[PDB]
C-alpha cells in the first residue's frame, strides 16, 4: 500500500480562495519517497489540530516534480493550514473572513 510522505513540502503557488469558502493550495514535494500520502491538517490558533476540513480525498504525491493541488475548507477566523508531518511540516497561517 501507500506510505505517508515524511519529506518536506513547499508552496508552489499562492493559496487561493474559491466561491464556496475553500482554499486552493499547490505544493511541490521535495522527498524521494513518492508515491506517498500527503499529511494534511487544520491546526487552529491554539496549535491543536482540527477535525477533517479536507475536501480532497486521499491526496498523494506520485512524482516529486509534479505539483499536487489540495482543496481545504479552513474554519472561520485564524487557523493554520498544515501540509507535511512532524518536523518537516509546512504551517500556513490563514484568515477566513465573515463568520
Amino acid at each position, epitope marked *: 500500500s501507500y506510505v*505517508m510522505c515524511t519529506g518536506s513540502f513547499k508552496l508552489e503557488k499562492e493559496v487561493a480562495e474559491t466561491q464556496h469558502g475553500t482554499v486552493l493550495v499547490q505544493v511541490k514535494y521535495e522527498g524521494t*519517497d513518492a508515491p506517498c500520502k500527503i499529511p494534511f491538517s487544520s491546526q487552529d490558533e491554539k496549535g491543536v489540530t482540527q477535525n477533517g476540513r479536507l475536501i480532497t480525498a486521499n491526496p498523494i504525491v506520485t512524482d516529486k516534480e509534479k505539483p499536487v493541488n489540495i482543496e481545504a475548507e479552513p474554519p472561520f477566523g485564524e487557523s493554520y493550514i498544515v501540509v507535511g508531518a512532524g518536523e518537516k511540516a509546512l504551517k500556513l497561517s490563514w484568515f477566513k473572513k465573515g463568520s
Partner: antibody
Amino acid sequence: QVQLQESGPGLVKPSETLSLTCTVSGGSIDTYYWSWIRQTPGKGLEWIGCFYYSVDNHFNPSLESRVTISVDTSKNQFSLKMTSMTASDTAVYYCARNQPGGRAFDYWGPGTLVTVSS
Amino acid sequence: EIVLTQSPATLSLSPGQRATLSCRASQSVSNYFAWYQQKPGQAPRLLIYDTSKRATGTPARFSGSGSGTDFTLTISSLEPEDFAVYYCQERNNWPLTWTFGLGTKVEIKR
C-alpha cells in the same frame, strides 16, 4: 544524536515467541517511520516491518502472519513479536529509523543476536 | 518483487586504487537507491542515498550514480579503513517493501 538500542533474550526455544524492544534516544518515535530489520549469515539483510505511530504499519509479506509491532511512546520504546521461532530465524535483529523523505534507513541500532535453540 | 544483484561478490584492491561496485535491479522502481557500509561487528551504516547523495559522515571519495536498472557506488581513492561489506537497497512501491542486495565484500591488499 538519534540513537537506537535493541534488547532481547539471546536465546529462544524453538516454537516459542521472540520479544524484542527498541529504546530510542535523541528524538521521539511519535513521528517518522521506524523499522525492524534482521541479518543472517546465509541470507543477508531482510526488512521485517515498520510503523508510523497512530497512523499505519507495513510488514514484509514473507513474515506478516508471524509478526506484530507495538509502541510505548511514554518510554520511547517499540517492540517486535515473532511467533513460532524456527532455527532459520537465528539472526542479528536491528531496529532502525526510516529516513524522513527518503527510501533508506538513516540510523541503526547495534543489533542483538537471537539464537533459536533448546 | 524487485531483486538486486551486486557485482562482484568480492573486490580486492590496493590502497589508492579506484573501486566500482555495481547494483543491478530485476525491474525499475525508483531512481533513488541507497548504499550501506558494514564494518566488522558493526551495524550497516548509511553511506549514499538517493543514488548520489552523501550521507552525513560519508567522505568525499565515495560517490554514487545510476539510471534506472543498475546503479554504481564508486570509491575514488581506496583506503585501509574502507574494508567493509557494501549493500545497495531500494524501496519497492507495490507490494511495499525495502530490499537489499547481497553485498560486495571489499578487501584491502597490502
